[PDB]
Structures are given as structure tokens and as C-alpha cells.
Symmetry: C3
Subunit: 258 residues, 3 copies
Amino acid sequence: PHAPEFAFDPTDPWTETFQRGLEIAGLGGKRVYEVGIGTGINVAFMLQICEAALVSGSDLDPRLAGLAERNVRDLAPRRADRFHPVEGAVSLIDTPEARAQVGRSDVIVGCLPQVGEPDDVYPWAEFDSYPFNSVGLGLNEALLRRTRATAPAADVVLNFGARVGSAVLFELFEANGYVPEKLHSQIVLQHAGTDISFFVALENALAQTGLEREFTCEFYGDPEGATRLSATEAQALVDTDSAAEIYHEVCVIRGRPA
Amino acid sequence: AFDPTDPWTETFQRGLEIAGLGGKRVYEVGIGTGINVAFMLQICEAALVSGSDLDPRLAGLAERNVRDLAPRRADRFHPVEGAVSLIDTPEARAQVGRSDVIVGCLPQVGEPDDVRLRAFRTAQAAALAAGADTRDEDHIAHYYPWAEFDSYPFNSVGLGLNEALLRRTRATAPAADVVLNFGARVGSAVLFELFEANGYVPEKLHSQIVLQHAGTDISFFVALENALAQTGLEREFTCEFYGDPEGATRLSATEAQALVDTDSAAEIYHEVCVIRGRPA
Amino acid sequence: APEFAFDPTDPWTETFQRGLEIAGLGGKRVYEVGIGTGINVAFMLQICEAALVSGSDLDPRLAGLAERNVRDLAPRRADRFHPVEGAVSLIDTPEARAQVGRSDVIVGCLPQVGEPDDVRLRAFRTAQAAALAAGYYPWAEFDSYPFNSVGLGLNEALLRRTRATAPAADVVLNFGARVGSAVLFELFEANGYVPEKLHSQIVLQHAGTDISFFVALENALAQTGLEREFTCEFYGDPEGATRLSATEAQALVDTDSAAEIYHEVCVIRGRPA
């Protein structure tokens, strides 16, 4: 009954949105696998604040597993005995060990590369064929094919920019064997350098049939998400003013198998 | 007996009879006013029928409707309330998971151009028969969306919504049959691949030659005939139309549109068929 | 297993057969999609020591010609070969599904973009000849597959069938690797299979081979309409020391004609979880 505000990072609104969803997910007592553990701070968060029973994970970069280990031992010293990462270079979960560990997990979590992520920030062309790569989420769909096969009973909890709308995000789960549920969302502001052509091209794109398409992306003018904008609209306000403040939603969605 | 003004629905119903729904639990996606619910209950002798529609005002009407249509069996009709897109609600999924068979005539490119007008007139006919004098808008609606089904592989032949329902059925009812109605202009091979690609063995249960209204646009199907493949290599493809009500003289989409570029009332036919998908 | 057994006339089939031997089919019950004239059946019974080989073909005449070829080439094993009859597209008959569902391993060298340009004329001449004795896959229904974007749509269509009909069976497939192994592996990972590359060779491509489809791959913009980095894998030498894009390969030949262009063929096994 006391929100752990001190815990969520004050720096990155994407990671903050993720961590708040992880807290809501209810990871207490579960085995959890994180795709792309990075520096390990999410693992530390899930161990210390969420109270996961066990956490494993992997990264594409082999040096990151070892560095994640220090961090977890520094930041969650009295819970670090429960962090068992998988070394070494692991794209998605594509090694036998990563597969074994995913196979034993109750929840798979991640914030994966996706069109629309922040610039500041996997191999990439082999995911181009995925149907949901048409909205920039191929890599995310690639993981859902793997999780459904290796751990068919586990939840999958993923972080998304929601410029394409929640009907599409929910579709990515429904198309792949999972009932989706939005755990948490937030309005976030994007850098002034962010490119969004991709998003204007989306609403200007003919279907695929192809016939029609009066669809519109989701942006906001205020940090409260009061004033909706299309991608074209938004793209305008920046042609008007290069330092115009543009907002979109980031949200955490859990897919639960049947 | 069947209404011959709506051949897609005749086709649908005739297909359902053949399905073998005697004593089974069935879910219908898009129950409408319950015409198909009552049919299965009265003619097919189903033990239980449930289902939903994306218009939330419809279940109530249907219920009523089925009561009047099959009162001696309307107690086995158990609709699910709410604005149910496909089977997207816990309660909807729950019922689907308990069903032996899932049936639908779903939106799809090539459905009759007047399908949304017929539904509006059927909704308002059913409310008048229930003793209510209403506002017309009570029977209109903004359903079904389309953008989230656009990325589906089989949306390229206009069946994205149908594919999406198959992703759903397979996961929440992996042993259930799925019985679906389609316009076959794209070819029965393509219709069969829709099922095969999604874990189902297809069987064509019944089919019929029907005529398309004169003002029906078929440039979509023409556009498929001139398209290249995903490869960018030449694609060989032909749509299936007919010049005769019997389905004896075949026409591609390009030919069919020629006969209405020269004349303007040339009778143009195509197939409508019921396909059952059965999992292994 | 002796060198003489592997096909000395055809690098694609030689690659397939070296890969099947490495798959360890001994004692297994196997199913081949596209048996053709049955030589691979003979190779799997006689060299791989399979307990039982079934399979089918789209051309309904080939199962009968494959029986005679297996009777004449592995007479001591011929009783272990039980082809499925009739025209069979992939495995799409109740008898082919029933056999596939009893199989330990499903194998195939399936039609695919990048196959040798003369394979369809071979199969045609090969029919006719073998047809005495005495007396193709369309590609339109498979065009929707995501992996058709790389020309592997028929292969993906099989993976959807095997997974449903024989969920515990391995699946062993021969591929040209011009689109790279990450893509080939992703075809399996996307469809419920863990890929392992069993064997691979560097083959020479016929002289007038059209590689325009692969050039186009290197210049396409993805599904998102933005940039994409991608090079097909070709080689200038028969050991693959010197790499080449499809564009480099095409250019090497625009200025020659008889330039030697090489690429990889490789056998991948897809194992369920």
C-alpha cells in the first residue's frame, strides 16, 4: 500500500513505464526470464521490489551478463542469489540454455527493439518478413513464436510504444496465441529529434489487399494526453515549430495463454 | 424454408446442416438477429447454441427473436452480451472453449455490397416485431474495424478477418471444428490454404453459384490477376467467376469485368461455399 | 558411410544426402515430401538404414516409378518402402497425413526460389523417360506466406502442416542459402522448430542462372518502408573464401558471362520443443 516511487528510474520514461508494469504484473514468487537483461537494473528491480522467486535472462551482448551480475549484487545484495543469467551471446532466446531456462519460467518479460523506440538507444533483417513488422514490431512477434513453443504456459510481458494504437498491439498477441491485457500506460514525450515519417507513412498507406485505409496513429499535444493528434498532424506542428513538444503513449502489455 | 433473396445465407445454412451439428455445442461469431441461431436449433438439432455480435444492442434482439422463432428450443440459446469483436471477451472465450463447433459468416472482401443495408433493415424489422417504434440510428452501427487485421497473410486475398478468427479458435478451442462461409472468387485452393496454414484440415461442405448485384466492384479481384508475387516474380493467378447460373462457363476477373465494360447488365456469377476446418 | 553413395551428378542432391546420413535416420520411420523417382528413398533405406520409408509426390505417376527404382536399387530393403499413392500436394490427403503422423522424421528438398533453373525440365524429361517402362506446385496459394518474401513460401507451408499433423517429428529440409542462415533459421523458429544446420556445401550455379530476384532483395525497403541492410551470400571460389553480394555476383557476370558464381546449399533439421 505504498507505491515504491523511489524505485522506478527518473531518467528514462520507457524503462519507468516498464518497471511500473512489472510491479503490477505480480511477479512475487515466480521464475522470470528477461530478454535483453542489459546492465541488470530491471533484474535488480524485479528481485528487490517485485520479489520474484528467481530471475534469469540473457543478452545479445556477451559482456552484459557479467556486468548485470555485479549490479544485481550491488543493488539487491540480499536477493542476488536468485539471479542466474545465461551467458553468452543470445539473440532472442536462441540457444539451448536460454531455451531450457525459458522453459522453466512462469513469466517472460522484455522491452525489445521496435520501430519508434528512442534514438538514444537485434540482428534485424531476418524479422522483416513477420506480418506485424508492418507496424514495426517484428522482433516482438518473433519472440512470441518462440515463447509459445518453448514455454506454452508462461505469461509474456512486453513494453511498447503505442503510436499504432492498442487495437494493433492487442492484435499482435491475439494473432499469436495470447490474450492481452494492458497492465500500465503512460504519456511520454519524445525527443525533439525523433523521426516519425514511418508513422505518417503508416496512415497514408494503402492496405495490403489493397483497398482504402482511413486509419490514424495516436499522438498527443499535452503531457496529459488530452489533445489527440495524428502522425500527419503531429508532423506538422514540428514543421511549424522545430521544438514543438510531441507526446505518445508507452505501455506494458501481458499476454496470457489460454 | 430458405429465403432466396439472400443466397449467401442459404448457402451458409445448407452448409451447417451438412456439418453434423446434431447434439453439439456451437458458437456463432456474429449472431446478428439470431436467424442462424434459430436455424441450428430448429433444423440442425444442436444441444446448445451460444455466440455474440460486435453490436452490443443485438444480443437482446436476437434473444427475443429466437424466442419467437423456436420457442420450443430457445432455452438452449445462450448469447453472450457486450460488444464482442470476434471472440474477444473472457466470457466469449469461455464459451468458445466449451464449444465443439465454431461457425461464422464473417466480413470479407467480396461480401455482397448490400450486406450492411440488409443488416440494418433486419435489425429494425426485428425491433418493430417486438413492439418498439424506434429511432433509425438504433439499428445502425460502426462495425467491424479493419486496420488491426490488415497485416494478416490472407488479408492479401481479402480474408484477413477470417484468418484472425482461426488464430483465436486454435488457441482457446484446439479440438473444436470451425465452419466458415466464403466467397470463392479467389479460388478454392486459396480458401483451403487459409485453413491449412493455421492448423486445420479443410473440407468443403456445400457450395452454390450465385449472382452478384450489377453494381458490384470487382477491381480488387482484377488487381489480384495483374499482381506480381511477394517475390516480385511473375505470378500466375486467376479468379473464379462464371457467366452462367450453372457454373458452366468460367470467367477470370479480367474477363468478367470486360463483359460489364461492354454491356452493363451482363449476369456475373461466382461461388459461395461452406468450409469446415478440423484440427488434427 | 562410403563416398560412392552420395549423388555425384548433382550438388543439391549430394548436399541433401550427406545431410540425411548425418541426421541419423537409422531405425526411424521416415516420410519424404516429393519422392520423385525414389533415389532418395533408395539412399535412405540402403545407406541410412531407415526402418521404414513412406512419402508422396504431386505427379501421381512417380510413386509407381519410385517403387521400381527402389526394387532395382535396394532389393534387400524394398519391402520397407510404402509410398502413398495419388497426386499429393505437400501432405494434403488423409492417407499422407496418416502416414506423416506416424513418422519420426519428415524430409524434403522442396521447390524454392533459387533452385536450379533447369529442375522443372529435368522432372518433365525424367517423367517421360522413366514412364517407359510402359505407357508444378502452383505458387499462388503459397504466395501469402511471410517467408515467401525470401522465396521459401512452399517450405513454410509444409512447416504449418507438419507441426499440426506430426508435432513430435523432426523435419529435415534442403535449402539454397543465398538469403543467409539467419533467415533460414528464422523460417524454423517462426513456425515452432529449433533449427540445426546438419551439413552444407558450396555449389556452382549454372552459367545462365537468373539471380535477379536476389539482387532485388538487396535493394528492397522492408515491410516498414524504411532502410534495410541485407546482402545475399554468393562466392567467387569453390571453397567460399571470397564473398560476394548478389549485386557483386551479378556485376561479375555482366562483365563476363562465364564468370564463376558459387553459393551455399545446406540441410537444416527443425526439432520441435
